[PDB]
């Protein structure tokens, strides 16, 4: 057995580089508005976010015009508003503002969420912070804004099989077999994920 020291060294170097000269996200969450592309990467944005990109704002930028970086405030995603009747928002507990950006914006921020008026204990790191679908909720009409008030057949063949099995066993049992989605929840597709689990470019 020979040792591949050089490879290891290279890996270490790479790691170091990643640690150090990593792009502070002023650079790589930038947007050229007229051409709808990006510095650093160079790739375009998708069509279904062009108008949105143009005529609405970042979360962190929005925050930037508040004392304490709006640490005890509500905030909403425009998409959610469009979609649901129900009140849908986060409240903040923290900000990680990327300092390198002239007129501070872009970075990270987080707190408690509530999708369709259903809160959660503990504060995750919140997704879509650098998207442009965001709006700030004023303190006047804040409490006005926040106002809120099983079993299914098996598929044809499986059920039949089950019945057959039962018969074989001995019992007749006219009670039909059924599966219950009381356990199986259906958190929607527009429900947000977690920035702890995602990797940054």
């Amino acid at each position: 057995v020979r040792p591949r020291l050089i490879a290891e060294l290279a890996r270490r170097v790479r790691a170091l580089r990643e640690q150090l000269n990593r792009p502070r996200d002023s650079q790589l969450y930038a947007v050229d508005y007229e051409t709808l592309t990006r510095p650093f990467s160079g790739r375009r944005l998708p069509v279904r976010a062009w108008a949105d990109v143009r005529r609405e704002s970042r979360l962190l930028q929005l925050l930037g015009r508040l004392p304490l970086f709006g640490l005890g405030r509500l905030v909403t995603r425009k998409s959610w508003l469009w979609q649901h009747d129900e009140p849908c928002y986060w409240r903040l507990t923290r900000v990680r503002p990327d300092y390198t950006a002239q007129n501070l914006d872009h970075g990270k921020a987080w707190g408690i969420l509530t999708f369709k008026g259903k809160t959660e204990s503990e504060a995750r790191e919140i997704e879509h912070v650098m998207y442009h679908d965001w709006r700030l909720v004023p303190k006047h009409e804040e409490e006005a804004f926040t106002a809120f008030t099983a079993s299914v057949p098996y598929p044809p063949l499986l059920r039949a099989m089950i019945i057959a099995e039962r018969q074989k066993n001995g019992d007749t049992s006219t009670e039909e077999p059924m599966l219950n989605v009381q356990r199986i929840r259906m958190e929607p597709w527009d429900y947000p994920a977690k920035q702890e689990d995602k990797g940054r470019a």
Binding site: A51, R55, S57, G64, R65, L66, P67, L68, F69, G70, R73, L81, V95, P97, Y99, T100, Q102, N103, L104, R135, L136, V137, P138, K139, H140, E141, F145
Partner: protein, 328 residues
């Protein structure tokens, strides 16, 4: 109201050294404590010095500690400004807002307003008011003062206003307009609503809410009407606006949800009815003046307490620093 503050407590009185240190920190791309910034702010004694401090503040804002820019420091800066010139530099900082990171949601604003009043300057005052509105404020009794100022401005400002300005005016009217105690407040609110309605109708719904503490929901005229009706249960400008409306891209509103351009005559009728009701039942500047003359019992004890707290915090910080030094 200056001599209560001017017991600042002593620190070092050399600025050049501090500046050098700051530069070094920035050269290295290392963070800086708030304490140093505070000290710098305290030290200033010239317009050049003020300028330097401004720059330093900006630098701090663009650093690993954007936060930690404590209220106390801001207050000190404001005081310094007041002492020297005030009405150009502080205002500029406020305008910049995000760059100098000052966010003085406090009695500082009130003080500034008072100062402005003392030496006329109306446009600047208006600007300041607008800035305050843009920041989420108006728990304190400076609201009344702000309203008064706005009214005064209006008394001069009587033309077509224009896009941004109208919106700003509306904002000013609205958020300070939370005066349940008197009908003047209600009137102000109504006026604000009317302005906002006008803005909506001429230009767009997005034009209203984009940057302001204001809510996307379409019914602003309706809201105003409701408010007016509430008063009755318990204006000329509005009427004019309505008349104008009556006289001869993306879509946030729905197909089912009805367009407010096609609800006008009904709205007008409703307004008329409301007016009639008011008449059956049974100037603004004067009212505001009267209000000012009454009320206004101050927040001075609280201020003192806050100051004390700040001092304590500073002391704690100093102690911490000392400990660190010892450790080193």
């Amino acid at each position: 109201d200056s001599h209560k503050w001017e017991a600042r407590e002593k620190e070092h009185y050399c600025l050049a050294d501090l500046a050098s240190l700051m530069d070094k920190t920035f050269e290295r791309k290392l963070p800086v404590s708030s304490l140093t910034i505070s000290r710098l702010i305290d030290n200033i004694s010239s317009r050049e010095e003020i300028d330097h401090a401004e720059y330093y503040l900006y630098k701090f804002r663009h650093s690993p500690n954007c936060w930690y820019l404590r209220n106390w420091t801001i207050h000190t800066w404001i005081r310094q400004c007041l002492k020297y010139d005030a009405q150009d530099k502080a205002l500029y900082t406020l305008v910049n807002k995000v760059q100098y990171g000052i966010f003085p949601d406090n009695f500082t604003f009130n003080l500034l307003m008072d100062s402005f009043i003392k030496k006329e300057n109306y446009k600047d005052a208006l600007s300041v008011v607008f800035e305050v509105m843009m920041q989420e404020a108006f728990e304190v009794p400076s609201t009344q003062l702000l309203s008064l100022y706005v009214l005064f401005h209006c008394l001069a400002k009587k033309t077509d206003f224009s896009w941004e300005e109208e919106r700003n005016f509306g904002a000013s009217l609205l958020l300070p307009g939370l005066k349940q105690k008197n009908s003047v407040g209600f009137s102000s609110q109504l006026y604000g609503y009317a302005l906002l309605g006008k803005v909506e109708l001429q230009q767009g719904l997005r034009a209203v809410y984009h940057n302001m503490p204001l809510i996307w929901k379409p019914g602003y005229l309706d809201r105003a009407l409701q408010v007016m009706e509430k008063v009755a249960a318990s204006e000329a400008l509005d009427v004019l606006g309505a008349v104008l409306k009556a006289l001869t891209k993306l879509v946030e509103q729905l197909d089912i949800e009805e367009t407010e351009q096609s609800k006008l005559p009904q709205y007008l009728e409703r307004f008329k009815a409301l007016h009639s009701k008011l008449q059956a039942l049974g100037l603004t500047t004067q009212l505001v003046k009267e209000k000012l003359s009454t009320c206004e019992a101050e927040d001075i004890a609280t201020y003192e307490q806050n100051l004390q707290q700040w001092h304590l915090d500073l002391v704690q910080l100093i102690q911490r620093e000392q400990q660190q030094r010892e450790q080193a």
